[PDB]
Design goal:
The structure is cut from a larger assembly and holds three copies of chain A. The first copy, chain A, is mostly loops and 49 residues long. The first copy, chain A, has one helix spanning 2-5. Chain A is flat, with a radius of gyration of 15 Å. Chains in contact: A-B, A-C, B-C. The complex binds a molecule of 2 linked components (NAG-NAG) (2 copies). The site of a molecule of 2 linked components (NAG-NAG) has 5 residues of chain B, from loops. Chain C: Glycans are attached at residue 39.
Chain lengths: 49, 48, 48
Amino acid sequence: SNNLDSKVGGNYNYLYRLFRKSNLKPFERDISTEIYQAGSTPCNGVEGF
Amino acid sequence: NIIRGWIFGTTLDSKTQSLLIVNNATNVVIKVCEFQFCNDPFLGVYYH
Amino acid sequence: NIDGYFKIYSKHTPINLVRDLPQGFSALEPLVDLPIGINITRFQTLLA
Ligand SMILES: *[C@@H]1O[C@H](CO)[C@@H](O[C@@H]2O[C@H](CO)[C@@H](O)[C@H](O)[C@H]2NC(C)=O)[C@H](O)[C@H]1NC(C)=O
Ligand SMILES: *[C@@H]1O[C@H](CO)[C@@H](O[C@@H]2O[C@H](CO)[C@@H](O)[C@H](O)[C@H]2NC(C)=O)[C@H](O)[C@H]1NC(C)=O
């Protein structure tokens, strides 16, 4: 779809989920925007280390 | 006709999606959204 | 809730019982199947 979807600076309107605690089930859909914890620390608000 | 429907989901407070199924007085309605549900959710009637 | 499909089976029967689940047998027919695709871990019924 490069001739439809691509744009010279990049069509950043297409998103994928980079992080998830566990792999999702067959035909499951997840719409949460909530911050992923990669550290052993808990994390709150908009961001953290 | 006291029992009229169910919530199904995980967070139930719009952190995630959830399912509503309701049989309200005129129609059945089924809906899947990021719902913010009540603590004591119900449907209510003016009596006699 | 199987592989993103939410499956509802149901039955209705007339009764005359005061305060228990009636002792007997009858099977539920498959009513509807809904392609909702969302984790369910909890539920809550809605009273009138
Ligand atoms: C659906 O949601 C539940 C609850 O959010 C997930 O189970 C949680 O998973 C983490 C990691 O194993 C635990 O720390 C929580 O205590 C669990 N809670 C419950 C109620 O299970 C479950 O993994 C989710 N299912 C899918 C397929 O993502
Ligand atoms: C039962 O609930 C549905 C919604 O679940 C109500 O439907 C709405 O009705 C208004 C007025 O006609 C419309 O403007 C909305 O767009 C409708 N939305 C939906 C989702 O149907 C319906 O009115 C309710 N019925 C009763 C008797 O309360």
